[PDB]
Amino acid sequence: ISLLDAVDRTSRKAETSAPERVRQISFPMMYFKEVESITPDEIQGVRQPGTA
């Protein structure tokens, strides 16, 4: 918006207003993966810490 400007009463002149402005945007996203595995070698004959 702008500020109005004084004009004369008989010249009949006036002033108008400018239109708006529209734009568009896009967005890419982020991907994360985690992998694990379980093997019997981790359990076979292994003492539990803190136990005899």
């Binding site: 379980i38 019997p40 070698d41 076979q44 004959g45």
Partner: protein, 52 residues
């Protein structure tokens, strides 16, 4: 050494049957983890027919 068999009482024979991929046939596996022993080996006398 298969999953779900760790730290379990072993048996005489482990028989495993596995289906091949697509439809190509059957796979088999047989396992045995054993060792016989004698706690008084001095009583295992061997004899011979010749002279000393």
């Amino acid at each position: 050494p298969k999953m779900g068999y760790a730290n379990t009482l072993g048996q005489e024979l482990y028989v495993f049957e596995y289906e091949k991929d697509r439809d190509e046939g059957i796979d088999f596996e047989a396992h045995s983890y054993m060792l016989p022993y004698c706690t008084r080996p001095q009583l295992l006398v061997d004899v011979r027919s010749d002279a000393e």
